[PDB]
UniProtKB/Swiss-Prot annotation:
Residues 7-87 form the PDZ domain. It comes from Rattus norvegicus (Rat). This is Disks large homolog 4. The chain holds residues 309 to 411 of 724 of the full protein. Expressed in brain (at protein level). Detected in juxtaparanodal zones in the central nervous system and at nerve terminal plexuses of basket cells in the cerebellum. Expressed in cerebrum. Expressed in hippocampal neurons (at protein level). Isoform 1 and isoform 2: highly expressed in cerebellum, cortex, hippocampus, and corpus striatum. Belongs to the MAGUK family. Interacts through its PDZ domains with ANO2 and NETO1. Interacts with KCNJ4. Interacts through its first two PDZ domains with GRIN2A, GRIN2B, GRIN2C and GRIN2D. Interacts with ERBB4. Interacts with KCNA1, KCNA2, KCNA3 and KCNA4. Interacts with LRRC4 and LRRC4B. Interacts with SYNGAP1. Interacts with ASIC3. Interacts with SEMA4C. Interacts with CXADR. Interacts with KCND2. Interacts (via first PDZ domain) with CRIPT. Interacts through its first PDZ domain with GRIK2 and KCNA4. Interacts through its second PDZ domain with the PDZ domain of NOS1 or the C-terminus of CAPON. The gene is Dlg4. Palmitoylated. Palmitoylation is required for targeting to postsynaptic density, plasma membrane and synapses. Palmitoylation by ZDHHC2 occurs when the synaptic activity decreases and induces DLG4 synaptic clustering. Palmitoylation by ZDHHC15 regulates trafficking to the postsynaptic density and function in synaptogenesis. Palmitoylation may play a role in glutamate receptor GRIA1 synapse clustering. Depalmitoylated by ABHD17A and ABHD17B and to a lesser extent by ABHD17C, ABHD12, ABHD13, LYPLA1 and LYPLA2. Ubiquitinated by MDM2 in response to NMDA receptor activation, leading to proteasome-mediated degradation of DLG4 which is required for AMPA receptor endocytosis.
Length: 113
């Protein structure tokens, strides 16, 4: 898999981008948790679950809060230029939050874009 940052351009009409984000803790970043089948992100075929979102329309999200990221993505207009970087090892830390909890005995804080 390409692990280097990738410049992705999504064209959408008047809908969401059709993916979910998790993250926003300091040092954590903003990750794709889910891609909706038939949404603009899916149809493009370029984004994946476990991608970190580094930038949207020239707004740096590498250390954004969850709310900052959600608002930047929702308000990005119809031509969305994303810098993404595939980091599945870092992504598995979100899966470990739910796993660790069900073991130490649950949903992630997640927004649909
Ligand atoms: C409150 N949620 C995080 C679940 C969705 C909106 O950001
Ligand atoms: Cl660019």
């Amino acid at each position: 898999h390409n692990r280097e940052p990738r410049r992705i351009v999504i064209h959408r009409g008047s809908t969401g981008l059709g993916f979910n984000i998790v993250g926003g803790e300091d040092g954590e970043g903003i990750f794709i948790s889910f891609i909706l089948a038939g949404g603009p992100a899916d149809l493009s075929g370029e984004l994946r679950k476990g991608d970190q979102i580094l930038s949207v329309n020239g707004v740096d999200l590498r250390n954004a809060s969850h709310e900052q990221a959600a608002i930047a993505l929702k308000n990005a207009g119809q031509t969305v230029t994303i810098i993404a970087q595939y980091k599945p090892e870092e992504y598995s830390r979100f899966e470990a939050k739910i796993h660790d909890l069900r073991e130490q005995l649950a949903r992630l804080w997640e927004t649909s874009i």
